[PDB]
Design a protein around this ligand. Structure first.
Ligand SMILES: *Cc1cc2c(cc1C)nc1c(=O)[nH]c(=O)nc-1n2C[C@H](O)[C@H](O)[C@H](O)COP(=O)(O)OP(=O)(O)OC[C@H]1O[C@@H](n2cnc3c(N)ncnc32)[C@H](O)[C@@H]1O
Ligand SMILES: *Cc1cc2c(cc1C)nc1c(=O)[nH]c(=O)nc-1n2C[C@H](O)[C@H](O)[C@H](O)COP(=O)(O)OP(=O)(O)OC[C@H]1O[C@@H](n2cnc3c(N)ncnc32)[C@H](O)[C@@H]1O
Ligand SMILES: CN(CCOc1ccc(C[C@H]2SC(=O)NC2=O)cc1)c1ccccn1
Ligand SMILES: CN(CCOc1ccc(C[C@H]2SC(=O)NC2=O)cc1)c1ccccn1
Lengths: 494, 499
């Protein structure tokens, strides 16, 4: 019944918070709705795949908190394969390339593409990571969708198509679904365009040996019976001396404080006494999660490597079910596999099909893009549609429709009496990622330590030393990238 | 514990559903989260006001279902005061007028205004009431906000400003917050622009004598102990032969079928076994309700009438806390009052203030708009901020942001095994209103009767005879209104002549 702090949710954020509080000598209890920990991370094990991440997987340079936590728990990383060429498939043809951005040959299209990426970072520089609503043009940018912004910025259909794929892949949502201010914040708070899109030296550089699920699992191992599985929280009462937290399976927990470590909208599944303040009451109805099916097709060998392809495919257009792939082969070179995402509206559309039907569509696509009949002979298939999850709401993360971030953004991590807010959505660096989950969980934990008078105010937010195993190299630009005119810039010069 | 149908929610929709099923011989239970019925309707009674609707209030011609239900329950209507002149307040000055639309004198501005309203209805005629996602340009229109559409359509700032107020007032949301397809559907399914904005001959023509809360209250009286107050539903389990519905106060109910008569997003407050299908699981996270504070200021006398003002004020300007008012005086002529709405971002902004601070700002606004120092002498004040309600989520109703209606709209009233969906949001005529609540509750009830083999399929959806008490004048246009060019239409005519 009784403890110091109840943590609602046993994903990476809830586990990170619970570990910090436990290590500080407090009695913690984690209440998890599912029969497993990990949340939006999930590692499946079987003989065919050995292990596979069906949820969150990638980590990379500048994500120092998740790297430090995993290392402490005994985990190692390996590099996602990017030795050979990437492929950009456009208008039914594959164009192999090297470097993070797909190249453009037409001079007008070149200027347009260059300007788009540059402008994304230009705008981001005016958006505070810890308060995007304080951007000088916050209201103007929040009142526009990404579709509207792209319509203004992109003078070529080539740039608009790639920009659209970029948005879809980053946030699993349509350009017309999301606020421009929120999306620009999202990219900036991951370190900008290059950092977020890059495998080598970016967010997709590495995976955990044995799977990312091990982070939450190994913290559960430490905490023992402090983690309560199949305990969905239904009710939180703050009217009395101690906070009371009730679960669906009829149990009552009593604590001094609570950490909410669930997606913001899933706060709706809890009945509150007293009611939430007006702003949070409405906020949690305004913040949906994106839509994605993660699909992994297995092959006898990583045959693409023989053609000097690394397995990365960037596939434009409405017809293709999957817009982006990476090589998912094990470090040993076995369990050869291609990972692909079915994104946003396509997740909704293709969910109607059978698993076997999706497999056929993916294999035929891969055969076309890789130019190999070997793609038509899969040995195994795994997939997960995150849209179906009651206790996630979607993946990868929460997006903000136009008008919401400026009106409600301030209340995301505002404490409600003795409830403090974790979850990757509340992070200021790599929000949306496993890194953000760690940042937010540890910060919420320290807010409580401060409330108990155990630490000073200046220790609530804490810097992280850089990983020695995954060091970051600087992001650079060329003179031409910095100074070439936009399309309208070249027109005004003429 | 055991019954035929559990109805979740005791608002007008749930109560209408329960009544129909009860009248048909079935054993029903209504599980209501609050210590009262009525939901988004709420009639406050005290000695200072006698009675006052703090939620849903207005009914009008073409809303035949709510009129029939209320009549059967022994209720009467009266007409909202529109004897004297309406006021349009713009750029800090008041312009009195008659007719539903504020008049425009500038010929260019006139063309632009005429074309705006006309085009709203033109686009509306392309949108099926029962399937808005089937409009030929559904995707194009759904992928645009109302802000984007107004930016394209309005060639004058005057039209754009009034159109913005129109959107804010209809759906308690900003133009940039809402899908154009969804808003165009919402207006069309109320009968169009003229019907939705009109007092005389429109949505705001009448109120119930004694308050709208009586509708839900009198149905509760008929049902007796079948209505369970302070039973918020937390869990629905459909894995076994009978459906199990659990409440927060620990009770278990067992039924053949369930009707969910709550706002769609409030379905999130219920844990489902088995989990909802993917499309509904995500839909209920994508559909917020609007933001509004309804405010009623009381005076010694309806002093505005002496100046030939009826009490209606259409007020444009960021500084104005309230964008729209109506006379709220009792039909007897006493308890003189002005009702005003604080809309969308202003509801969020001004919620920070005290009740006394809000009263002061409203009085100062009304004094300026009415050119009357008497407005600074209120005798009483009542208000309700609907944004604070755990079991409503907002008011008046659910809005759809860009992209949602085409992707998720199909599943709004699709049954989930033995769960059927009521609530005003699922109506096809006056969705968002008390009328829509009645339509959806009775339709959901009949879906269950059909499932039980009690009625044929063709009786699920039923037409409603027109009220004999509230006649509906047709919506008409003039020749000039039909055929006058838009601003770009005129520019094309100029370009062609100069060739
Ligand atoms: C789904 C997904 C996510 C993902 C991605 C690809 C997919 C398909 N790829 C990623 C990647 O390559 N690298 C990366 O860093 N992140 C990636 N993501 C996102 C990542 O998985 C998430 O950012 C992260 O996992 C979020 O962690 P967080 O701890 O903040 O949130 P959570 O995992 O959703 O955990 C919440 C837990 O709470 C439980 N829950 C929900 N409701 C209740 C109630 N009422 N009571 C008790 N518990 C509750 C959930 O079950 C969950 O365990
Ligand atoms: C708020 C408002 C509404 C309004 C309006 C002005 C305001 C400020 N003006 C209107 C008007 O002039 N004319 C009109 O016709 N409508 C007007 N509206 C809207 C109108 O009030 C609504 O459309 C209508 O009342 C909605 O009826 P409906 O039955 O569909 O929905 P509800 O009233 O919200 O009732 C739902 C009930 O369910 C209970 N609830 C919620 N969650 C649960 C759970 N988990 N378990 C059990 N019960 C639950 C609510 O408490 C509510 O009673
Ligand atoms: C388009 N252009 C080339 C690269 O585009 C990318 C955009 C986003 C990303 C990051 C995505 S991939 C992932 O696993 N999660 C993300 O956020 C990667 C590549
Ligand atoms: C703008 N123009 C003049 C009239 O504008 C109106 C627009 C909508 C409405 C209907 C609003 S008032 C109400 O009580 N609820 C509504 O839907 C009334 C007038």
């Amino acid at each position: 019944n009784k403890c110091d702090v109840v943590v609602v949710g046993g994903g990476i954020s809830g586990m990170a918070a619970a570990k910090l509080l436990h290590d500080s000598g407090l009695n913690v209890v984690v209440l998890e709705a599912r029969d497993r920990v990990g949340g939006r991370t999930y590692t499946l094990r079987n003989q065919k795949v050995k292990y596979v991440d069906l949820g969150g997987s990638y980590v990379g340079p500048t994500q120092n908190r998740i790297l430090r936590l995993a290392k402490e728990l005994g985990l190692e990383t390996y590099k996602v394969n990017e030795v050979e060429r990437l492929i950009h498939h456009v208008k039914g043809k594959s164009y192999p390339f090297r470097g993070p951005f797909p190249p453009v040959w037409n001079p007008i299209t070149y200027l347009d593409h260059n300007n788009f990426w540059r402008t994304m970072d230009d705008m981001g520089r005016e958006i505070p990571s810890d308060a995007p609503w304080k951007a000088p043009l916050a209201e103007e940018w929040d009142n526009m969708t990404m579709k509207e912004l792209l319509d203004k910025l992109c003078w070529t259909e080539s740039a608009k198509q790639l920009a659209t794929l970029f948005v879809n892949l980053c946030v699993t949502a349509e350009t017309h679904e999301v606020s421009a201010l929120w999306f620009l914040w999202y990219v900036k708070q991951c370190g900008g365009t290059t950092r977020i899109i890059s495998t080598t030296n970016g967010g997709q550089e590495r995976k955990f040996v044995g799977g990312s699920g091990q982070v939450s699992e190994r913290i559960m191992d430490l905490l023992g019976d402090r983690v309560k599985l199949e305990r969905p929280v239904i009710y939180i009462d703050q009217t009395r001396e101690n906070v009371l937290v009730e679960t669906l399976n009829h149990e009552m927990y009593e604590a001094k404080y609570v950490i909410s470590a669930i997606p913001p909208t899933l706060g709706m599944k809890i009945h509150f006494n007293p009611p939430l303040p007006m702003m949070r009451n409405q906020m949690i109805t305004r913040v949906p999660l994106g839509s994605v099916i993660k699909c992994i097709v297995y092959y006898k060998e990583p045959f693409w490597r023989k053609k000097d392809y690394c397995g990365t495919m960037i596939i434009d257009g409405e017809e293709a079910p999957v817009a982006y792939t990476l090589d998912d082969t094990k470090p040993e070179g076995n369990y050869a596999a291609i990972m692909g995402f079915i994104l946003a509206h396509k997740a909704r559309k293709l969910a109607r099909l059978t698993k076997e039907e999706r497999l056929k569509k993916l294999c035929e696509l891969y055969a076309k893009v890789l130019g190999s009949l070997e793609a038509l002979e899969p040995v195994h298939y795994e997939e997960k549609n995150w849209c179906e999850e009651q206790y996630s709401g979607g993946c990868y993360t929460t997006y903000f429709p136009p008008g919401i971030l400026t009106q409600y953004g301030r209340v995301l991590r505002q404490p409600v009496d003795r409830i403090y807010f974790a979850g990757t959505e509340t992070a200021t660096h790599w929000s949306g990622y496993m890194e953000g989950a760690v940042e937010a969980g540890e910060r919420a934990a320290r807010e409580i330590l401060h409330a108990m008078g155990k630490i000073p105010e200046d220790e609530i937010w804490q810097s992280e030393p850089e990983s020695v195993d995954v060091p970051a190299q600087p992001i650079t630009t060329t003179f031409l990238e910095r100074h070439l005119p936009s399309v309208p810039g070249l027109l005004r010069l003429i």
